[PDB]
Each structure stands twice: as structure tokens, then as C-alpha cells.
Curated annotation (Swiss-Prot), chain A:
Function: Serine/threonine protein kinase which activates checkpoint signaling upon genotoxic stresses such as ionizing radiation (IR), ultraviolet light (UV), or DNA replication stalling, thereby acting as a DNA damage sensor. Recognizes the substrate consensus sequence [ST]-Q. Recruited in complex with protein LCD1 by the single-strand-binding protein complex RPA to DNA lesions in order to initiate the DNA repair by homologous recombination, after the MRX-complex and TEL1 are displaced. Phosphorylates LCD1 and RPA2, a subunit of RPA, involved in DNA replication, repair and recombination.
Consequence when changing residue 781 to S: In MEC1-100; impairs both the G1/S and intra-S damage checkpoints but not the G2/M damage checkpoint
Full protein name: Serine/threonine-protein kinase MEC1
Signal peptide range in chain numbering: none
Provenance organism: Saccharomyces cerevisiae (strain ATCC 204508 / S288c)
The FAT domain, residue ranges: 494-857
Assembly notes: Interacts with LCD1, which is required for localization MEC1 to the RPA complex. Interacts directly with the RPA subunits RFA1 and RFA2.
Curated annotation (Swiss-Prot), chain B:
Highest taxon listed in the record's lineage: Eukaryota
Protein's job: Forms a complex with the serine/threonine kinase MEC1 which activates checkpoint signaling upon genotoxic stresses. The MEC1-LCD1 complex is recruited by the single-strand-binding protein complex RPA to DNA lesions in order to initiate the DNA repair by homologous recombination, after the MRX-complex and TEL1 are displaced. Required for the recruitment of MEC1 to DNA lesions, the activation of CHK1 and RAD53 kinases and phosphorylation of RAD9 in response to DNA damage. Required for cell growth and meiotic recombination.
Organism: Saccharomyces cerevisiae (strain ATCC 204508 / S288c) (Baker's yeast)
PTM notes: Phosphorylated by MEC1 in a cell cycle dependent manner and in response to DNA damage.
Localisation: Cytoplasm; Nucleus
Further remark: Present with 606 molecules/cell in log phase SD medium.
Name this protein carries in UniProt: DNA damage checkpoint protein LCD1
Length: 857, 293
């Protein structure tokens, strides 16, 4: 409380006094009381260590604990100790610097194991910093550094650190992983499970989306080191949330594995990290009440098998052995049962206030039918602390009431549920309605999701007891189970989620299909529902179902039948159709530009209709990618004066353009300012939330986010033998994107857009390579229209293969002979030249004669 | 507005009579239609990132009209001060003076970002009137419209001014207010009456006008390229320091006139005078003497 006091009395001098006491307390104390509140001191100390002039004696306190605390401990703490001292290094002046060396030399000699084994990540970062000289000065042990480095694999650690919220260690790890990956691509060691970090990185950026822009940038830069990752191979990610249907009721053995699964998972990691000083009192009690089964010490402290359970994760063992003897009752409460509020009552304040409260005040349901003996009844003491954690235990309790299959408690639920199901919606105030109601729904469905998972195993459990299906009581349960779906009222809940359309789309699809599928079938029912699916399947992002569905039902006006033709490999006819309507209408001109761009016609939309803020994002994107410096200034000069923009989308697209120009002026300093400036936006406003299922949905985001780094990295080349040696890295780099087309095209074209603008002799000799590389794609990518232009445009360099490469692309075209005559001529052309490869003399004659047979006899 | 200034001053004589008045209430109103330039907030939101077109030419038209106004104000009074003995009493009325408070009281803020181009002209009014009050007698018609609540307010807002120490080398840099009067680089241009600062952008004002097409909208200057010697630090410093050799000469007038009866002198400027007096006597002696400035 003191350090964290509201400072009505202020006087930080006490903070100096406090560290004295808990410096003294450790000096003389029993080992368990040395552990005891250790979770608290570390927090309560590091919040001291962060304050201005008090930092000195903080480190003074630490060198104490480092000497004697525990060798098996100094895991859960040293972390926040190392990350800090590496970030603030500039602020340590003469003295504080010294004490640090007094810690490390101990950390060297006092612990020759911990850093090398129990926390291997520690040693690498501090050595990684060349400025501290731990590699240079002090011990010879750097041979142990070299030993431990190659051995351990860092990938899993980075997924572990980033999950915590401590704004330093999370800032540290991103700094290493950057410096980590840069070293890889130089030696190109591992092609890859690199996906885990990419799952974690994209979580942080979504957590800090509002807070700390400048970090949240750096989180985006690092995934650009990755670059697309080729969906085709490893989709990775995972399915969905954690419900852990353990069947808590009865089955004492099965009850237990739940209990330990709670404590080391949603309890310790809740109590350990979080700062709510008084709440920490309540967490132990239910832990104790849980350990009340194992409570008696000698039972856990002596007999071999009387416990025998792991009972903790390796980290979770910290608070395990401390409280086993504690049992702090702290149960005093005044009129909880007489305070009962029922039947949609609190729901009034829910919609009035909420996300937290409606579920919080739903603790009234907790303390009503819970807190009697049993097992989980102690959890009333948990929510007693009150809270997004309540959400976790929410279903479990919400189960218990209708599990019983005294009576009025069950029907009191639905009164709020239907009040939650039907809010009359159309809520004038969005801020509350947008916010809480989603969580309500997400909490609402969570039970329904659980029951299905529940009832499935619930019968499948007794399916081992067989008897086909024979139960007396499960009936009333099953009768009640589906009765929980009676509040769904079919379409009511279908439209509950249909009017909501929460970011969970596949569930948004299921019911939406469900209702549409069986019961109504009526004409207008297929009227509105079908139009929803199109929006639905649109967002899942797999265009198959979008095609097949939009084909069958379809109807409306025959203009739609003309629109669908895109996906069928016919689009060249359909795309020829929209150009008609465009030249002639607010949404027309949009559909044209969207299609043309979607099928990767870039050379069109720059030059066609764009010489209404929805089109610029498309228009300014192309001209950026095409890359004529002259046509590009015209855009920027048109964008710059609107006296406003307020569009998240074009700002990303602008800032790339305003960079490219600065290449043409030879201003590597300037072009850094914009490329970085792109990241803050791409990693704030455009980053999605966490999972979002499929990885392929991302390609449009990452593909734009891979090319950037190239444009920054090439423009960072100095001259000549750095440049030429540089592109080889970028050459090799392109391998990890796979063989897919549109991810590749957008990337390699953006190299052309750069490689023209520089206009130095060295840029040239590459520009003839880029095109001919773009030729070999388009051809075997089953587009010969993209190929011919490109290959045509590199004929000015008149490469020796540029001729034959044409004779290639034509021989796929139906006209056989006009092709064949080319190699007929070329093959004899090189005859008597008596030069070039004599290996190249083969390459033609191979392709030559194999034509000479399949073509004609 | 600029072109109107060249009109006002040409050969003032007795030419302008009330033409100043109807001019003043207009401009004093026009300055009111423009707030959001001078009322900008002091602190920028952490969650406000800077990525935008970063265009400077819609600011530059915002600033010019603000500045050029505040000269035209001073341009008026200096002209009115050229008119015969009792002719002054014609002009001033509760209408003109009430309108003015909302200008001055708008300029010096203390809740909002300062702007160093108006502060000069914001003061010179507060000066020139108190220089003319003593001259021609029968003070503002026995101060027909001067309210102790009004008046003393206008002075109690100067006490905040004197307390900013204008360290000669931190002038152009960005920092928090009440530290110093910084005069940021984005708006420096000669104004009208006097050339205040080196106006690095003094030549951009011709770069927004195109010069062929006959266009309404500006030509889109860019904030990146606007603005190696320190010496321009000293000048803007010195030329700034006069301002504190002004707010003094506000005071002597103030002591002459009211004869100490009202609450103005009872506010004990000797509190704020001396607290200023003692300061320089500390800093001048310690940290300055000998550095050749």
C-alpha cells in the first residue's frame, strides 16, 4: 500500500524506509517466510526501483537477494531484473553502473548454473550487448557462451516472454529477435517452427493497439523480417478458445484434475502477475480451499503416494509450497443472500452502464446457489474479490443451476437471458452498446458452446458404461439441455448473432445457415438470409463457398449473373463488360476498379478511369507499384491538399509513395523517415486481432508488409560491391514465399518500381534481370498477357535468351509454326559464331528438336 | 488585410475620423471568427501518432491572418494617437473596449500554447492606450469604460509573462511553455510594423501562389523542407528581450494614473517586481558575465 499509496501524504522518504525493512526482513527470517510474499516484494520492490532517485538502494536491496535467496528460485524475478538494467543503461552514470558489475560477477560466480541452464535466455542478451563488455571484460567463460549458444534454440523462448505484460521485458525481447533474425538471413541457416513467434508478435500489436504507438511500431517491423511465410506449407495457428470440459460434478478423481488444472493455469498466472494488492488475499483462500484436500502438511510432506500429483507447473511450484499451511478464512460478509437481485433487474443497469458489470453483478447468481460445501463452492470467495476473470468461471457456475434438472433458480436465468437475447437492439448510445453487448454475447454463447462440448462428452462418458442410451436423470438434463436452446428461439438467437454479426464468423455462419436451412424455408426467409451469407463467406476469405453459393441461388437481376463471371477463368469477358458501365453511378466505378486490380491489372487502372475517396486507395496504390516517377508526383500533388484525410487506408498508401520519390532525389535519410512512418500505421490501425483463423486471409496485409523492408534495405545500400552483394541476399530471400503468384507478383514488381527510379548504371544491369524473371512467372503462372509485355519491355537490352523466351510464350499460344521458325533461325544463327557457352548451344537445340517432333512429323 | 494596412497609415492626418472605429470592430470581430489557431491545446496525445500528408500551407494561411490582424490593431491605435487634443474621446466607448478584452484575453492564454508574434502586438495596445490615457486629460472620460474587474484582469495576466526567463540559446527549440518564450520556427515572418525574426520562411509566401493558372487553392508547400549558425539565436533573443523592457514601461504609467486608490497597486507589484529584481541579480552575476555576448 505504502509505495502505491494515493500520496495524500506523499513523502517518498518512507519508500526509502520501506526498502530498509524488507532488506532487513530477508537478513533474518525463516526460508518459507523468506519466500512467503516474494511475489509481492518483487512487484513492490520493482515499482520502487522504477522511481527516480530511489533507484540506488533498490539495486542495493537486489544484491542481497542474489547472494542468498534460492538457487532454484531467481527465475520469476531475475527476468524483470535483467530486462530493466539493459534498457536504462544510459541513465546509470558512474555509481549505479558499478553496483551492476557487482551483481553480474556474482551472477557469474555465485550462479554458474541458473543462467546457463534454468534461464538460458538471460546469458545471451547481456552478452549480446557489446557495450557492457561481459564478453570482453571479466571472465573467460565466453567459451561457455559459444557452447550454450549453438545448443539451445531460441524460438520457443520468445513465445514465452512476449506473453507477459511488462513494458520493458516485452520491449527487450523485440530488440533481440530483430538482431536475432538479421543474423539468420546472412547465413540463411533455418528455413523452418518459426510460426509461433509470428503468432505472438501479432498478439502484442493487438494488445498495445491503443497504447504506446512507438513500441507497437517495432512490433510490426520485426514480422517484416519474416515475409509472408508461404501459407501452402504450414498453416499453423490453432482452432479456438479454452473451455476444458472436465466434468467437475462428482467423480472425485475427475474433480481433482480439474482442480489442479485450475490452480496452475487460471489462478497462479492470475495472482502472480496481476497487481491488485487486496485481491491477492482472496486468491490464496480458494487455493487453500482447493489444497484443503491436500491440506494436511505431513500428508503432502511425508507419505510417498498420498499426494504423488505434479500439482504445479515448474513455475507454479513457487506459490505451491508457501501457502500449503496457511488457510486464511477471511469469509466475513454482510447480507449477501438477502441482497439477491433477480429477473432482469441488473440487466437494466447492464445496458445502462457493463461488459464487466453484467457478469460482475452476475456474482449475485454465484453467491446465491454457490458457497455451500461441495468443491467449487469456495470459488464464491474468488469472484468475491470481483473483472474479466469471472468470465472464465462463468460457464462452470452457469452450468450448475440447470444441471440439477429450488426450482425457481433455473427459470430466473432465462429472464435475464431473453433480456440479454432481445435488448430491442437499435441502441441509441453506441459506446456502451458496441462495447458490452459483444462481451455479453461472447459470454452468452460461451455457455451454449460449452453445453455442446459438455453434453457430447457427458453422454460419451457414460457411453463407456454403454446401455445404448439409458438414463433416467440425464433425460431431465437433456430435456433442460436443449431447453437452454429454447431461449435461442431458433431464428431469435440466429438473428441475435445475425443482427450482431460478431467478429466470430464461422459461428455467425452456422446459425445463419441453420435457421435458413431447415425450419422456415419460406420465400422472404431466403430473401434476407441469402444476402447475409454473401457478406459472411466474404469475410471467411475462402472464395470457393462464395462462388458456389452465389452461383446457385443468385437470381435478382441478370447484371449479377454478369458479375459472377470473374471467378470462372472467364473474367477477361466479364472484365471487358464492366469497362462499359464505367465509361458511362456511385458504386459502378468502384466495382470496375476493384475487379481490375483484384486480377492484377496494374497498367490499366493508372491510365484508365482515375484521371470518391474509395477509389484513391486503389488508384494511388497502382501508380505506386507501376513506378513511373513522373506520373507519381501528380498523385501526391493531388493527395497532399485535401485539408484533411482521416482515412486509415490511403495514409498507408501515400506514405510509401512519398518515399519512392525521395529515392529519385538520392536522399537515403529521408526515405527512412517515411518507410518507418509506414510501419507505425501498418502495425497499429491495420493489424488484426490475434488468431483470426486462416493465415491466407493475411497475405494482402503481409505482402504489402514484406515489400517495404526490401525498399528500406535496398535503399540502405552504400555503393557497388555492397549493392551487388546485397541483392543476392534479397534474391535468396524470395525463396520462402512459395510458388504462389499474387504474393510473388506484388513483391517482385515493387522491385522494378525501385530499380527504375535509381537510374545508375548498376541499377540497369539488374533491371534487365528483374523483367526476365517476371517473364518466367507469368508464363508458367498461366497468364501469357502479363508475360509478353514484360518480355517485350526487356528486348531493348536484347539479351540472347530474350528472343527464344518469346518463341517459348508463343508456342503455348495455338499458333505453332510462327514460334517454331524462330528457334529454326536462332539455332543456325549461333552456328559458326563459335562463341558463348557451348552449354547454351545445347539449351536451344534441346528445345529445338523436341519441338521438331511433337509439332510436325 | 496586409493591403488594408498600407491603406490605413498612408498620410493619416485628420483624414481618418471614425473610419478607424468601424474598421476596428470589424477586425476585432474577424479575429474572433478565428479561434482554433490561438486556442490549440498544450499537450499532444500519446495515442495521436503523426502520419498524415504533413502539409504546411493550410497552417500558413491560418497564421498570416492572425498575425496581420494584430498589427492592424496596433496600426489603428498608433494612427488614432496622431489625432488632435480632445479628438480621442470620440472613439472609445464600451462597445469598442469590451470587444477588445476578448482579443487580449485570448492572446496570452496560460491554458494554451503561446504564440510569440501576437504577444508583442498584444502588449503594444495595452501600452499605447496607457500612454495616451495620461496625455490628453479627462482619462477615458473619467474611465467611463474601464472596469477594475476588467482592468486588473488585463494586468494580472502580465505577471505570468515576466516570469519566463528567455535563455538565449533555447529560443528556437521546442519545449514546454512557462519555461521560456520559444518562438517556434514554423511561424516566423516579418508581420507588418516591425521585423521580429529572421523569417527563414519569409520567401515561401510566394511559393504557394503558383503564378500562372489563376487558382483559388494554394500550391501545397511541404513541412519537411522548411528550415548553419547559432548567431540568429542572439538576435531573436535580444529582439525578444526588449519586450521585458516594455512591460516595465507599462507599469510607470499605471502608477502615475490611478493614484493608488483602486486594487491595482494594492496587488503589491513589489511582490512581483522584487521577485524579478532579485532573480537577474543572481543569474547575471553567476552564470553570464564574461561570455562575450
Amino acid at each position: 500500500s505504502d509505495i502505491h499509496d494515493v500520496e495524500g501524504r506523499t513523502t517518498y522518504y518512507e519508500k526509502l524506509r520501506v526498502i530498509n525493512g524488507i532488506s532487513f526482513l530477508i537478513i533474518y527470517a525463516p526460508k518459507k517466510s523468506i519466500i512467503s510474499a516474494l511475489a509481492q516484494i518483487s512487484i513492490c520492490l520493482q515499482t520502487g526501483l522504477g522511481l527516480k532517485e530511489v533507484r540506488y538502494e533498490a539495486f542495493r536491496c537486489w544484491h542481497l537477494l542474489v547472494r542468498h535467496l534460492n538457487d532454484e528460485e531467481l527465475s520469476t524475478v531475475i527476468d524483470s531484473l535483467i530486462a530493466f538494467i539493459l534498457q536504462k543503461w544510459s541513465e546509470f552514470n558512474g555509481k549505479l553502473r558499478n553496483i551492476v558489475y557487482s551483481i553480474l560477477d556474482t551472477l557469474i560466480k555465485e550462479k554458474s548454473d541458473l543462467i546457463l541452464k534454468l534461464k538460458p535466455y538471460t546469458t545471451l542478451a547481456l552478452v549480446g550487448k557489446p557495450e557492457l563488455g561481459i564478453l570482453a571484460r571479466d571472465g573467460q567463460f565466453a567459451r561457455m557462451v559459444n557452447k550454450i549458444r549453438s545448443t539451445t534454440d531460441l524460438i520457443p523462448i520468445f513465445a514465452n516472454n512476449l506473453k507477459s505484460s511488462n513494458k520493458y521485458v516485452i520491449n527487450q525481447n523485440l530488440d533481440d529477435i530483430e538482431v536475432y533474425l538479421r543474423r539468420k538471413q546472412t547465413e540463411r541457416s533455418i528455413d523452418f517452427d518459426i510460426t509461433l513467434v509470428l503468432g505472438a508478435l501479432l498478439d502484442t500489436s493487438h494488445k498495445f493497439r491503443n497504447l504506446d504507438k512507438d513500441l507497437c511500431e517495432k512490433c510490426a517491423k520485426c514480422i517484416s523480417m519474416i515475409g509472408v511465410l508461404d501459407v501452402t506449407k504450414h498453416e499453423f495457428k490453432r482452432t479456438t478458445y479454452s473451455e476444458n470440459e472436465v466434468y467437475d460434478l462428482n467423480d472425485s478423481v475427475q474433480t481433482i484434475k480439474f482442480l489442479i488444472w485450475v490452480i496452475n493455469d487460471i489462478l497462479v498466472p492470475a495472482f502472480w502477475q496481476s497487481e491488485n494488492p487486496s485481491k491477492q488475499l482472496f486468491v490464496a483462500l480458494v487455493i487453500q480451499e482447493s489444497l484443503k484436500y491436500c491440506g494436511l502438511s505431513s500428508e503432502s510432506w511425508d507419505m510417498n503416494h498420498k499426494e504423488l500429483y505434479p500439482n504445479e507447473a515448474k513455475l507454479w511450484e513457487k506459490f505451491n509450497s508457501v501457502s500449503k499451511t496457511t488457510i486464511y478464512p477471511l469469509l466475513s460478509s454482510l447480507y449477501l443472500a438477502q441482497s439477491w437481485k433477480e429477473y432482469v433487474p441488473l440487466k437494466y443497469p447492464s445496458n445502462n452502464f457493463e461488459g464487466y458489470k453484467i457478469w460482475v453483478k452476475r456474482f449475485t447468481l454465484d453467491l446465491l446457489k454457490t458457497g455451500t460445501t461441495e468443491n467449487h463452492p469456495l470459488h464464491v470467495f474468488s469472484s468475491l474479490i470481483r473483472g474479466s476473470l469471472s468470465n472464465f468461471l462463468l460457464p462452470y457456475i452457469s452450468l450448475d443451476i440447470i444441471i440439477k434438472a429450488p426450482y425457481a433458480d433455473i427459470l430466473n436465468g432465462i429472464i435475464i437471458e431473453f433480456d440479454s437475447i432481445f435488448t430491442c437492439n437499435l441502441e441509441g448510445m453506441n459506446n456502451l452498446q458496441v462495447d458490452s453487448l459483444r462481451m455479453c454475447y461472447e459470454s452468452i454463447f460461451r455457455v451454449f458452446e460449452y453445453c455442446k462440448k459438455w453434453a457430447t462428452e457427458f453422454k460419451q462418458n457414460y457411453s463407456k458404461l454403454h446401455g445404448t442410451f439409458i438414463i433416467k436423470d440425464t433425460k431431465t438434463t437433456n430435456m433442460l439441455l436443449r431447453i437452454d436452446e429454447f431461449l435461442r428461439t431458433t431464428p431469435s438467437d440466429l438473428l441475435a448473432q445475425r443482427s450482431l454479426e460478431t467478429d466470430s464468423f464461422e459461428r455467425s455462419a452456422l446459425y445463419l445457415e441453420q435457421c435458413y436451412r431447415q425450419n422456415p424455408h419460406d420465400k422472404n426467409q431466403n430473401g434476407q438470409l441469402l444476402k447475409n451469407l454473401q457478406i459472411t463467406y466474404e469475410e471467411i476469405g475462402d472464395i470457393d463457398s462464395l462462388d458456389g453459393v452465389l452461383r446457385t441461388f443468385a437470381t435478382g437481376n441478370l447484371v449479377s449473373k454478369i458479375e459472377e463471371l470473374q471467378y470462372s477463368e472467364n473474367w477477361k469477358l466479364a472484365q471487358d463488360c464492366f469497362n462499359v458501365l464505367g465509361k458511362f453511378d456511385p458504386k459502378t466505378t468502384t466495382r470496375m476498379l476493384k475487379s481490375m486490380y483484384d486480377h492484377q491489372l496494374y497498367s490499366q487502372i493508372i491510365s484508365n478511369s482515375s484521371f470518391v475517396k474509395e477509389w484513391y486507395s486503389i488508384g494511388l496504390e497502382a501508380a505506386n507499384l507501376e513506378g513511373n516517377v513522373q506520373t507519381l508526383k501528380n498523385w501526391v500533388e493531388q493527395i497532399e491538399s485535401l485539408r484533411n484525410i482521416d482515412d486509415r487506408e490511403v495514409l498507408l498508401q501515400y506514405n510509401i509513395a512519398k518515399a519512392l520519390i525521395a529515392i529519385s532525389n538520392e536522399d537515403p535519410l529521408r526515405t527512412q523517415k517515411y518507410i518507418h512512418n509506414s510501419f507505425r500505421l501498418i502495425g497499429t490501425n491495420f493489424i488484426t486481432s490475434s488468431k483470426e483463423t486462416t493465415l491466407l486471409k493475411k497475405q494482402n496485409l503481409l505482402m504489402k508488409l514484406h515489400s517495404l523492408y526490401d525498399l528500406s534495405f535496398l535503399s540502405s545500400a552504400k555503393d557497388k560491391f555492397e549493392y551487388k552483394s546485397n541483392t543476392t541476399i534479397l534474391d535468396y530471400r524470395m525463396e520462402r514465399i512459395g510458388a504462389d503468384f499474387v504474393p510473388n507478383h506484388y513483391i517482385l514488381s515493387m522491385r522494378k518500381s525501385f530499380d527504375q527510379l535509381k537510374m545508375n548504371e548498376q541499377a540497369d544491369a539488374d533491371l534487365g534481370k528483374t523483367f526476365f524473371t517476371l517473364a518466367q512467372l507469368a508464363r508458367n503462372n498461366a497468364r501469357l498477357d502479363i508475360a509478353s509485355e514484360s518480355l517485350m519491355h526487356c528486348l531493348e537490352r536484347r539479351l540472347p535468351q530474350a528472343e527464344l523466351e518469346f518463341a517459348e510464350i508463343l508456342w503455348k499460344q495455338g499458333e505453332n509454326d510462327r514460334a517454331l521458325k524462330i528457334v529454326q533461325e536462332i539455332h543456325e544463327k549461333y552456328q559458326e559464331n563459335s562463341s558463348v557457352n557451348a552449354r547454351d548451344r545445347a539449351a536451344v537445340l534441346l528445345k529445338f528438336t523436341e519441338w521438331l517432333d511433337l509439332s510436325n512429323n | 488585410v496586409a493591403l488594408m494596412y498600407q491603406i490605413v497609415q498612408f498620410r493619416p492626418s485628420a483624414t481618418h475620423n471614425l473610419a478607424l472605429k468601424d474598421c476596428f470592430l470589424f477586425i476585432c470581430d474577424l479575429i474572433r471568427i478565428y479561434h482554433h489557431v490561438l486556442k490549440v491545446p498544450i499537450h499532444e496525445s500519446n495515442m495521436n501518432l503523426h502520419v498524415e500528408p504533413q502539409i504546411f500551407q493550410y497552417e500558413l494561411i491560418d497564421y498570416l491572418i492572425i498575425s496581420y490582424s494584430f498589427d492592424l490593431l496596433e496600426g489603428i491605435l498608433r494612427v488614432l494617437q496622431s489625432h488632435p487634443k480632445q479628438t480621442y474621446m470620440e472613439f472609445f466607448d464600451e462597445n469598442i473596449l469590451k470587444s477588445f478584452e476578448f482579443v487580449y484575453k485570448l492572446a496570452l492564454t496560460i491554458s494554451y500554447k503561446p504564440m510569440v508574434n501576437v504577444i508583442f502586438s498584444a502588449v503594444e495596445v495595452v501600452n499605447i492606450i496607457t500612454s495616451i490615457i495620461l496625455n490628453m486629460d479627462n482619462s477615458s472620460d473619467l474611465k467611463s469604460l474601464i472596469s477594475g474587474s476588467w482592468w486588473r484582469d488585463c494586468i494580472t495576466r502580465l505577471y505570468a509573462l515576466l516570469e519566463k526567463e528567455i535563455k538565449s540559446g533555447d529560443v528556437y527549440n521546442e519545449n514546454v511553455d512557462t519555461t521560456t518564450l520559444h518562438m517556434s520556427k514554423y511561424h516566423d515572418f516579418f508581420g507588418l510594423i516591425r521585423n521580429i525574426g529572421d523569417n527563414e520562411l519569409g520567401g515561401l509566401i510566394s511559393k504557394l501562389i503558383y503564378t500562372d493558372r489563376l487558382q483559388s487553392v494554394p500550391r501545397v508547400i511541404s513541412k519537411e523542407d522548411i528550415g548553419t549558425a547559432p548567431i540568429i539565436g542572439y538576435k531573436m533573443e535580444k529582439w525578444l528581450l526588449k519586450l521585458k523592457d516594455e512591460v516595465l514601461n507599462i507599469f510607470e504609467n499605471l502608477l502615475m494614473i490611478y493614484g493608488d486608490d483602486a486594487t491595482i497597486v494594492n496587488g503589491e507589484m513589489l511582490i512581483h517586481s522584487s521577485k524579478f529584481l532579485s532573480r537577474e541579480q543572481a543569474l547575471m552575476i553567476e552564470r553570464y558575465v564574461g561570455q562575450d555576448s
